[PDB]
């Protein structure tokens, strides 16, 4: 029936599907056909699916977080020793229940979690993230003093997408260069960013460079923002600087050539530290000081 | 009775609050203590090979083998005079070497298991399942767990590596031990050793005994040691309810260096370990010894060179005083290898909640 | 060499009761190795796992208790669970597992010894012990006691048979330093011989006895001796010498 | 305590280094791509030299040649350089005594055997010496004393028993043994002439020989006299102890650092380790003795010359020295190996606690082990060497080779089995 072909399905639409949420819901799908009563048949093949889809991972980092989820969910189900079948219509109900879920968690993001800018404080948002783009669309909707400063993001030209994106809502804006970044800390405000997921030790794991960005702010005094959905956090530990477990290249020094061919190997995933963080916001409550590492524990009672 | 007062050389102007000071050779004690106990006070007084880990699991040892001896009297009940000798016993310990958290916690446990069973059943039934309780609970808390640790590190260490270490933690030469043997990588090993006690000496010659690329410095040369070498690893003792890191001399020096060059530290610990005492610095309370370790004359232990120094008490206005433990800084260390396989040093007391 | 199923069936039923020894654990639950129900692994859960520390108790080698919840007659999974144990019931599986462990010893050592595979004497083993009797380790510790289930069916081998007896339970030695100061002696020897052996009996030195005494299981041997010393004893008691016992 | 002449005994050790010492004089060859003999001149002057006399004999055009050559021969020079000119192949007493003939010998004489480098002041040891001396009129000689590595294990061809004094630091026995290598003879002699007199009897055997005499005006006349004696420390110390003329001292000198000197290969081998490391106290190739000489110090016990040329990406291990004008390739594992002077070395080549000698050509895809090159042999494409493969004079190693382990090759242009001529003996070429 294949995972694969599902996340395939999806390409132009996005834009509110959470990824996390869709591989979720492809999962629940694969499950519900083969029998989830029993787990000596079920759950082993589950996780060979998951394994197979981390091997045929092109540069994706939420899916694995997303599947051990889905696992923990499953084992929390079957704690009430009741029966077995309606303990599964149950975890059956709960996919569409999850993805449904996304979008109220989203809502409530944007109604509460909105306060930050009111009296016209600039903003220097990287790394794309659907969250914080609905925050602001939805922060133009209520109507408030504010102005975007937007830093140039070279992976394929997501900065220009970024840029487009920005125009269909009505809102003056500015490209700076992540190298004039050291420059500009004076007239804007605050910095916020989106994440592709939180760490164990609770730094955050990014784009093309957000740790020089971090750097900056810690530098200036000015405070460093994450704004992501609560359910990026993966069993992963940058121990050092410059350490993540990536599908490419961690800077590879090319041979002499001469045509002029290897070159673009730069670093298009970077970590920073977690004192960094001054605030993160999520659906489940404003929390952020050791909030995740919390959470996991919670998760894995250990 | 005991013995009271007399102590050698100056007592200082500051960090004046803990014992420093004592009995050393021994001479008239009640005539009722178990000597097991003496001698271990005898070893850990005079200790150079100890550091936070085996302490425990050594007076774990002895408790044992006191239960095993132990008889009950005819007259009075199971516990009764036991408390007495329980209090009688960590008095001796004091005097000869200061109550580590690791062994407060096991107190606690006794105590709780002394709770547990009330003066009702026969001698030779009860002890044999406390004995056999205490073994299950050393075999899940401890070695388990330093296996897990271990595994843990195993899988966290990458291709090509050199490493700079410090400590007599018997965690860390597990590992280091594990990475020469089991695992066969490119592993470069870099020793820092300390004045008060040759830890550093020890971890080199138990490396030799293996056969590892083995490269011997100290405190003060570092500045030219870097000058290619990436991970700093480091041993703690115990893990306060602030989230600083409370453990023994040179570590958190090396640490400060790790951060300024680059590459952060990480650090090892156990999920027994942790306090609920609140001290964000060294002068709270610490473990001081005699000035008599800071008396020998480089080189080796054994050596004994009439030179320059070799007086205290008859020198005016002269304070010679060393600190063991030390408390580093909290941002510093990034990596903590726990019961939890991994996490952040800032949690401070999520595991002491759950117990 | 270990193989093959305990019982006449393969994959186990409905209700039924196993044994798991765990090698790891902590994922999904653990994916271990029967001893109760054949060496081929199966899967028990971390949700029925948890009754009343959780991480600790089980790990490695200690012994864990499994109920077959849902069984896959085709192509080979099997459920086990630990927290449906019908309350003390897990003693008892405790138990039916240990025993299952000391069968497959006892049907080890013969394996080896006469070069023969392990499923046919399991197969040989298993009819008038773990159907008839109950279980096979207590049939084998009644045959121990007195012979009465092994005569149920005919054994190819006797030699294998023995060899377990041995294992279960023997020449003790014992050297009685005669210093005779009698007037008949040589007689009184010969009466004490043809008291004692009816084991076997050596002589290197003139004044030294050596004797060995072939014990039943081992403890049975204690008595024999002392029946030969107070003979011995009896014999130079009449005549007029002694005889020193060390 | 001022104004003493040095007496060097050179061309004495030959054969001894079974492949080399055929066509070039023992002491001439290089220790770390410089000539031996330079440490040993270097070390007198520390001393406390005036006028420096040399014993030369196999190949004594050369040394004379070196003399010239050499830095001591200019007018600048408190001491001058006047080789002793003496019929092929003679002992030590028979060298002793035509010195006697001759006629120099002043006072406290130095005389020192093979060549020794040390870390060790002088002075302090002269001093010593002076103030025994003026003790009682009949004393002879010093003897130099090292303590060795713990136990002894390494030590076969020269583990000397000193049975010792602590008072008067006095020699009662010497021995030597073959025990480690061959168990025929694991043993230990005590002789009684000696033992109601001393009373404080210690029984020492880790202790390390060194070879450098200072020596009285009796010794030559002692030698002249009694002519049986043609070695130095078999015979004659045993000699003196046993009374042979009544009433005399000796001394043995002990010292805690570090001194060894030069006898077999492997040692030899752990004396240049020694070097590279920082052992030696103010014995460093940093400094420039030679002058001519222009090395300077780098981390991680690195030695490297001016005008050295190494390419990017190569590991290097642990202590690595380099001789001035050398090319190194790409690819390259370098480790505890010395590489001489103007040597060019190829492509992708793993070493590991080799030697190698003055203008070397290291061929493509070879691996080094624990081996030795001497100078002008090269090595060429696919050679596979084992641990104390010793290579003579000009050897020519061409395409594909494999020797196992302890191979020594010959050095002259005859007994051993590979000769100087084209290919190693897989297939039978040679004279």
Same mark, same amino acid.
């Given at each position: ?302 | ?53 085996? /302490? ?51 107190? *606690? ?85 300390? *004045?008060?006690?040759?830890?550093? /000496? ?5 490396? /030799? ?96 060179? *009439? ?12 304070? /010679? ?35 | 060499?270990?193989? #093959? ?39 028990? $859960?971390? +949700? ?44 008892? #599986? ?15 050592? #013969? ?49 294998? $048979? ?19 100061? +009698? ?19 050596? $002589? ?43 | ?23 070039? @004089? ?9 000539? !031996? ?40 020079? @408190? ?7 003496? @019929? ?94 061959? %168990? ?7 002789? @009684? ?38 070695? !130095? ?12 003329? !009544? ?102 080549? %793993? ?81």
């Amino acid at each position: 029936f294949n995972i694969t072909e599902t996340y395939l399905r999806f390409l132009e639409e996005d834009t509110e599907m959470t990824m996390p949420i869709a591989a979720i819901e492809a999962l629940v799908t694969l499950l519900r056909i083969k029998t989830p009563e029993t787990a000596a048949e079920m759950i082993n093949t589950i996780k060979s699916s998951t394994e197979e889809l981390i091997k045929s991972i092109p540069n994706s980092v939420s899916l694995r977080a997303g599947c051990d989820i889905f696992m923990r969910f499953v084992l929390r189900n079957l704690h009430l020793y009741g029966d077995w079948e309606n303990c599964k219509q149950h975890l059956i109900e709960n996919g569409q229940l999850f993805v449904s879920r996304a979008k109220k968690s989203r809502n409530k993001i944007a109604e509460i979690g909105v306060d930050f800018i009111a009296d016209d404080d600039i903003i220097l948002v990287h790394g794309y993230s659907r969250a914080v783009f609905s925050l602001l669309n939805h922060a133009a909707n209520k109507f408030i003093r504010f102005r975007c400063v937007v830093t140039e993001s070279r992976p394929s030209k997501q900065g220009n997408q970024l840029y487009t994106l920005l125009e269909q809502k009505g809102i003056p804006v500015t490209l700076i260069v992540d190298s004039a970044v050291g420059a500009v800390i004076d007239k804007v405000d605050k910095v916020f960013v989106g994440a592709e997921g939180v760490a164990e030790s609770g730094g955050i794991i990014n784009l093309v460079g957000t740790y020089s960005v971090g750097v900056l702010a810690h530098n200036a005094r000015k405070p460093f923002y994450v704004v992501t959905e609560s359910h990026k956090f993966v069993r992963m530990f940058p121990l050092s600087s410059d350490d993540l477990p990536m599908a490419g290249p961690p800077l590879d020094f090319t041979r002499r050539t001469d045509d002029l061919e290897d070159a673009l190997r730069g670093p298009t995933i970077d970590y920073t530290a977690q004192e960094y963080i001054t605030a993160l916001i999520t659906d489940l409550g404003v929390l952020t000081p050791s909030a995740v590492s919390e959470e996991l524990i919670k998760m894995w009672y250990d | 009775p005991g013995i009271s007062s007399v102590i050698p050389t100056v007592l200082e102007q500051s960090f004046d609050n803990s014992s420093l000071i004592s009995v050393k050779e021994l001479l008239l004690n009640k005539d009722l203590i178990h000597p097991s106990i003496l001698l271990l006070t005898s070893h850990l007084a005079h200790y150079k090979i100890v550091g936070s880990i085996p /302490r425990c699991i050594a007076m774990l040892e002895v408790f044992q083998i006191v239960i095993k001896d132990y008889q009950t009297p005819k007259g009075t009940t199971l516990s009764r005079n036991l408390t007495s000798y329980l209090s009688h016993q960590i008095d001796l310990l004091k005097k000869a070497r200061p109550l580590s958290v690791t062994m407060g916690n096991a107190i *606690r446990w006794l105590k709780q298991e002394i709770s547990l069973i009330d003066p009702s059943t026969p001698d030779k039934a009860a002890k044999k399942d406390l004995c056999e309780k205490i073994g299950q609970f050393a075999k899940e808390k401890i070695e388990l767990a330093d296996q897990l640790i271990i595994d843990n590190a195993s899988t966290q260490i990458e291709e090509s590596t050199t490493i700079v270490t410090y400590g007599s933690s018997k965690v860390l030469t597990e590992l280091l031990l594990h990475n020469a043997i089991s695992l066969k990588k490119n592993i470069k090993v870099i020793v820092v050793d300390s *004045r008060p006690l040759f830890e550093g /000496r020890k971890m080199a010659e138990t490396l /030799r005994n293996a056969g590892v690329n083995v490269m011997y410095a100290l405190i003060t040369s570092l500045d030219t040691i870097f000058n290619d070498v990436d991970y700093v690893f480091l041993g703690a003792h115990s893990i306060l309810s602030n989230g600083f890191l409370y453990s023994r001399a040179g570590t958190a020096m090396l640490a400060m260096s790790a951060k300024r060059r680059n590459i952060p530290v990480l650090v090892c610990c156990e999920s027994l370990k942790f306090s609920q005492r609140v001290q964000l610095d060294s002068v709270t309370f610490n473990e001081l010894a005699d000035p008599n370790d800071l008396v020998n004359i480089d080189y080796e232990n054994p050596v004994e060179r *009439r030179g320059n120094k070799g007086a205290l008490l008859n020198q005016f206005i002269k304070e /010679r005083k060393f600190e063991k433990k030390k408390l580093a800084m909290e941002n510093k260390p990034k990596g903590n290898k726990i019961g939890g396989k991994k996490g952040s040093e800032g949690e401070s007391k999520d595991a002491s909640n759950e117990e | 060499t270990s193989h #093959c199923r305990f019982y006449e069936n393969k994959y186990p039923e409905i209700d039924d009761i196993v044994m798991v020894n765990v090698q790891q654990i902590a994922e999904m639950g653990a994916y271990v190795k029967l001893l109760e129900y054949d060496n081929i692994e199966g899967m028990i $859960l971390l +949700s029925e796992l948890s009754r009343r520390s959780i991480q600790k108790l089980i790990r490695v080698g200690k012994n864990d208790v499994a109920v077959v919840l849902r069984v896959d007659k085709e192509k080979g999974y099997i459920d086990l669970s630990k927290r449906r144990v019908s309350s003390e019931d897990i003693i008892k #599986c405790e138990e039916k597992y240990q025993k299952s462990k000391t069968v497959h010893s006892i049907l080890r050592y #013969c394996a080896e010894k006469f070069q023969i595979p392990l499923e046919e004497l399991y197969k040989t083993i298993a009819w008038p012990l773990s159907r008839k009797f109950g279980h096979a380790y207590e049939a084998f510790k009644l045959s121990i006691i007195d012979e009465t289930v092994w005569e149920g069916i005919e054994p190819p081998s006797k030699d294998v $048979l023995d060899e377990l007896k041995n294992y279960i339970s023997v020449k003790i030695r014992a050297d009685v330093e005669v210093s005779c100061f +009698s007037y008949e002696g040589i007689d009184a020897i010969k009466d004490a011989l043809k008291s004692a052996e009816d084991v076997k009996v050596k $002589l290197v030195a003139a004044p030294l006895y050596v004797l060995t005494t072939q014990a039943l299981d081992k403890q049975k041997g204690i008595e024999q001796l002392e029946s030969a010393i107070e003979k011995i004893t009896e014999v130079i008691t009449k005549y007029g010498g002694v005889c020193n016992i060390t | 305590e001022d104004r003493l002449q040095a007496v060097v005994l050179t061309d004495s050790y030959e054969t001894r280094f079974m492949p080399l010492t055929a066509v070039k @004089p023992r002491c001439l060859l290089p220790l770390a791509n410089v000539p !031996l003999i330079e440490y040993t001149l270097e070390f007198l002057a520390k001393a406390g030299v005036h006028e420096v006399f040399l014993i030369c004999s196999s190949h004594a055009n050369q040394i004379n040649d070196y003399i010239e050559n050499s830095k001591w021969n200019l007018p600048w020079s @408190p001491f001058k350089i006047t080789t002793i000119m003496s @019929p092929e192949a003679r002992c030590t007493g028979d060298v002793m005594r035509d010195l006697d003939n001759r006629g120099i010998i002043t006072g406290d004489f130095i005389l020192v055997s093979g060549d020794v480098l040390t870390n060790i002041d002088f002075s302090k040891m002269l001093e010593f010496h002076k103030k025994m001396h003026l003790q009682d009129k009949d004393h002879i000689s010093t003897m130099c004393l090292s303590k060795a590595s713990t136990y002894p294990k390494t030590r076969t061809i020269e583990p000397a028993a000193f049975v010792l004094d602590k008072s008067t630091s006095r020699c009662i026995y010497y021995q030597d043994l073959p025990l480690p290598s061959s %168990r025929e003879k694991t043993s230990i002699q005590i002789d @009684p002439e000696l033992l109601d007199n001393v009373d404080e009897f210690v029984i020492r055997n880790d202790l390390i020989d060194c070879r450098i005499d200072i020596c009285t005006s009796h010794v030559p006349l002692i030698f002249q006299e009694n002519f049986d004696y043609q070695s !130095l420390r078999t015979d004659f110390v045993k000699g003196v102890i046993s009374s042979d003329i !009544l009433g005399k001292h000796i001394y043995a000198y002990l010292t805690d650092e570090y001194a060894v000197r030069v006898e077999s290969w492997q040692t030899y081998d752990t004396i240049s380790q020694d070097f590279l490391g920082r052992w030696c106290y103010p014995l460093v190739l940093d400094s420039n003795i030679q002058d001519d000489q222009t090395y300077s110090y780098e981390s991680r016990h690195i030695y490297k010359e001016k005008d050295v040329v190494l390419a990017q990406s190569c590991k290097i291990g642990k202590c690595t020295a380099i001789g001035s004008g050398t090319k190194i390739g790409e690819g390259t594992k370098i480790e505890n190996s010395v590489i001489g002077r103007n040597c060019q070395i190829g492509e992708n080549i %793993r070493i590991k606690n080799s030697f190698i000698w003055d203008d070397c050509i290291i061929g493509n895809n070879s691996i080094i082990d624990h081996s030795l090159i001497a100078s002008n042999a090269t090595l060429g494409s696919n050679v596979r060497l084992n641990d104390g493969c010793i290579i003579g004079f000009n050897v020519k190693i061409d395409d594909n080779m494999d020797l196992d382990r302890n191979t020594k090759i010959s050095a002259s242009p005859q007994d051993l089995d590979d000769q100087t001529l084209a290919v190693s003996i897989v297939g039978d070429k040679g004279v």
